[PDB]
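Key idea: predict the complex, not the pieces.
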Amino acid sequence: KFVLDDRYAVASYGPTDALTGQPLDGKRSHGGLRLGEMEHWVLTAQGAMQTIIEKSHDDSDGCIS
Amino acid sequence: MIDQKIFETTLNIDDPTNFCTNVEAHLLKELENIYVGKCFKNSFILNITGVIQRSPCFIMRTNNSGRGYMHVRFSAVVSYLNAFDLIAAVKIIKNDSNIILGESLLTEPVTIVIPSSESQNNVAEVGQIVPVQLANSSVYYIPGRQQASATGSIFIPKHTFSVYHVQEELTQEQALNLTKLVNIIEMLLESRSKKDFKQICFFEKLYYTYSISSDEILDLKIWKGPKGKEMSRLKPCNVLSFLYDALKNKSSSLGFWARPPNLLKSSPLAYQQDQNSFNATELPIICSAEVMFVTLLKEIINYLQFMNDLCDTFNNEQLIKRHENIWMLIEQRKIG
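Result:
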């Protein structure tokens, strides 16, 4: 196990899924990292809703319907 | 016609701090910029009269921008066009390819499609202001469009008319709803009084079903105009006087109300018959006094506005010279 292989950092732009519009999964696909529902539970518990908007709408799929 | 309507919408504010400095002025400016000159809620917005109600400048929760929003209820002046409305000025942009259409040149923008089926429609030429009457189909106010869409044909006064039977006596305290409209017609007649009588006579005898050059002028202080034919030597009654009779509270509303083709349409006169003395092209409609009176008043207002607009838009004898061919279409169709 090497640190250089494990590390990953991604900026705003990258490949996106065709169906859901979300970032492609993982580092192999050059996409974003996952904030599962446990992370959402923790952020909700802390009351961090502007952070949730920033991460799950702007960084993830987000659209004016 | 021009009317007062109340809408309620939500306005997005990009800079709430600057917006709130003069809330009333900024709200009026935004409403004028967004809604004036566009079709909304089946109505064409002409101007914004005022803001009846509003809400505090909230801040958008869902997005992370500081932008705000404001619920605003505003009263505006709108133009709604029914069936059979008469538009004096309609310029034909493209009379070709067996399709015809023209744009209105009045305070209420409209795009009218004129079919090529009728010969009179084919006769009209481009760049010519031709009077038009909208068809029986309703006017399509597509939201966001800067002009209404409709279908119409060159106005040719039709000989077939209708007879209305009133089964209920005059509605009591609805005479005020009718009075709201008598005021509009009074304003129209005052406007007509200003312009010259000769042009009015020219257009009236052009669009009079039974053309009369006798130069005999029926004189009514509110309305003056060349006289027509007499059917059964019957006596018409002025609608304005009968409405004024509301103070008496007795108006003999039951009698059949009808306006024969001879009777000048702009003239407030209408014939009242105890029986169906008027020939019934169709079985007399069984309608209440409200429906009838509103209908007759609407028809006379439409015709009066048509005549004022005709006089105003054809104020040049040379334009009349160009449009004498349209006049010839109407005259040839006219019978008596």
